[PDB]
Symmetry: C2
Subunit: 153 residues, 2 copies
């Protein structure tokens, strides 16, 4: 029974570090991974002692309900497959509606495509980082409102 | 070629950093190892100001041709971490005053690239994940905190 927690879909480098950063801030995280029985083990240890890894498929809404999407703070589609991330978002919008969704893009080319599934937050690691680099090198100061603006869709 | 930026690479990160720098009004000199044909396609994707020097970033003579002696900073943004680390070393061998920026293609290479001491290190996956965590945790990120994440 998970509540007021974050659900992370995926086991990519972006997903793992986001889970760790969330744990470090005292947040509860529930991970869903389609990895093999053997790999789930290496991942649970890769994460820590309070690792809540639900072996399964996030495209399936029954696993999402199980993971607790009804009581989470947000669901994060962070795998290296943009088709699965786009779908995780669709499934979620189809279950609750008011649930907050975050989606990271693996291939910057797909950005306009995922815009179509309307996630609350979109993160393209390559474009976000390049835009920030451009500003910082240009001596421009980036305040909090500018940063959040590059994330909110 | 003075008071400008030099980007070594033609990866997705490289191209968008060049585009973003141009939009901010900054001049940029791009060096890539792409074949004659691919070079042409690259210049067209970078607009009319496309200053593309087909060559080898590891060769300090192409770096001089690109104007590292008079640049604002040199950016190592290709998808090959060996080449990015070498570009940095090359730069520190010429000016030792030239600002170096390096983007890690493979997160596992982070520790080994810190050994070449670049001025700025951008690990896209780590940077992005950390900012997501912060924002979802309700924190506010000010320019100082952001910069700190980039400074090596």
């Amino acid at each position: 029974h998970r509540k007021d927690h974050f659900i992370v879909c995926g086991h990519s480098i972006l997903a793992i570090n986001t889970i760790l950063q969330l744990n470090q801030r005292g947040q509860n995280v529930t991970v869903i991974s389609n990895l093999p029985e053997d790999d789930i083990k290496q991942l649970e240890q890769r994460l820590g002692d309070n690792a809540d890894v639900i072996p399964g498929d996030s495209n399936d809404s029954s696993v999402l309900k199980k993971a607790g999407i009804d009581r989470c703070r947000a669901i994060l589609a962070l795998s290296d497959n943009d088709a699965d991330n786009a779908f995780v978002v669709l499934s979620a919008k189809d279950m609750s509606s008011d649930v907050k969704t975050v989606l990271a893009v693996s291939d910057s080319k797909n950005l306009n495509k995922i815009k179509m599934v309307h996630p609350d937050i979109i993160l393209s690691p390559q474009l976000f980082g390049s835009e920030i680099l451009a500003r910082v090198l240009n001596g421009e100061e980036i305040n909090n409102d500018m940063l959040v603006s590059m994330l909110l869709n």
